[PDB]
Structure formats: C-alpha cells, structure tokens
Design a protein around this ligand. Structure first.
Ligand SMILES: [Cl-]
Ligand SMILES: [Cl-]
Ligand SMILES: [Cl-]
Ligand SMILES: [Cl-]
Ligand SMILES: [Cl-]
Ligand SMILES: [Cl-]
Lengths: 101, 101
C-alpha cells in the first residue's frame, strides 16, 4: 500500500523500501517501490530534495529515489512503518527525478 | 538521455528501454528507464493510458511503465530511436502510476 514501509524477504542491496505506487493502480503480484538506505554514514552533500531523509526505528534513512524499482509481492516482508506523513517530500522527489525543477 | 531508446548490452527480460530520467538529474553511472515489450502478442485489454503503445523498427511496442528501474551505464547499448515526440503519453503514464487520475 502506498507510503507503507516494508522489509525484504529476500536479501537486497538495502533493507527497507517504501511503496510509492498509487493504491488505485493495479499490477497483480507486484508493486513499485523506493529503497531506503541508512543515513548513518551517507554524505550530507546529497540533494535532500531528491533524496528525502526519513525516520524509522529511531534512526535516519535516505529515500533512494533513483533506485526505484518494482518488487514481486512474494518478497514483501513485514510492514515496519508508514511514511504517509512525508507524502509532500516523497512526491516532490519522485517528480524531480523525471521532470526536474 | 531522456526519451532516447536503447538496447541492453546484457540480456534482460525485455530488449529495449526508454530513458525517462530528467537530463538535469545527475546520477553518476546510472539512468532511470522503462522497458519496452513487443506488443505483438500482448493483450489489448491493457490500459493504454498507463501502458502507451509506441512504434520502433516498423513494429508496435508497449511501454512497461510498471517495470521502471535504473540501469547502470555499463549495460546501455546502442541508441535505436527517440521517443521525445511521445513525451505527453509518457509523462501521463508515469504520473498515473504514482498519483492516479
Ligand atoms: Cl543500508
Ligand atoms: Cl519521517
Ligand atoms: Cl499484495
Ligand atoms: Cl518482448
Ligand atoms: Cl510512436
Ligand atoms: Cl553515460
């Protein structure tokens, strides 16, 4: 479901992903998502508009907008959080990636 | 470059992909793309608004919007066509996937 965050059942580069696909867009067995990388060692020079910083599990994460990809529902693990409250920054980052400023 | 179509140097599910990332968005060594599937046997029931039909190599192709993913520049092969003339349908499909109608 859109803006919900889940873990991967099968190991991936990153450990969490936020579903960014519309809830009215039906793609049987799959969902478009954006991975979240730990912002623990990641550089601050990175555009926050394109790569929003979110907070889950008492830590900071970077939404890896440019690593967007679809995942089969078979790999969708437990839901760990809801990022719907960050819809504005998430929307802006996605739009920026395709259409610029 | 945005809206340009290329072949994969390494075999993938599909054989062509259209670069949909903004030309002002810099992601060293990678680009966000959408694969194109042959519309030869593919069903007509599929939403054309979400999955635009384009023409390359004297054949019809379906832009697999929901299979969007980034590819490393190392796998980007020869450029075969330019779909910039279909910017309107491409833009609408991408936007629809995330934000609905
Ligand atoms: Cl990480
Ligand atoms: Cl947050
Ligand atoms: Cl599901
Ligand atoms: Cl094909
Ligand atoms: Cl066309
Ligand atoms: Cl390049």
């Amino acid at each position: 479901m859109q803006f919900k965050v889940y873990t991967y059942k099968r190991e991936s580069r990153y450990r969490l992903f936020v579903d960014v696909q519309s809830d009215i867009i039906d793609t049987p067995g799959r969902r478009m998502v954006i991975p979240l990388a730990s912002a623990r060692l990641l550089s601050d020079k990175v555009s926050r508009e394109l790569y929003p910083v979110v907070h889950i599990g008492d830590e900071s994460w970077r939404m890896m907008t440019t690593d967007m990809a679809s995942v089969p529902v078979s790999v969708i693990g437990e839901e760990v959080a809801d990022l719907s409250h960050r819809e504005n920054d998430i929307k802006n980052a996605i739009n920026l990636m395709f259409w610029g400023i």
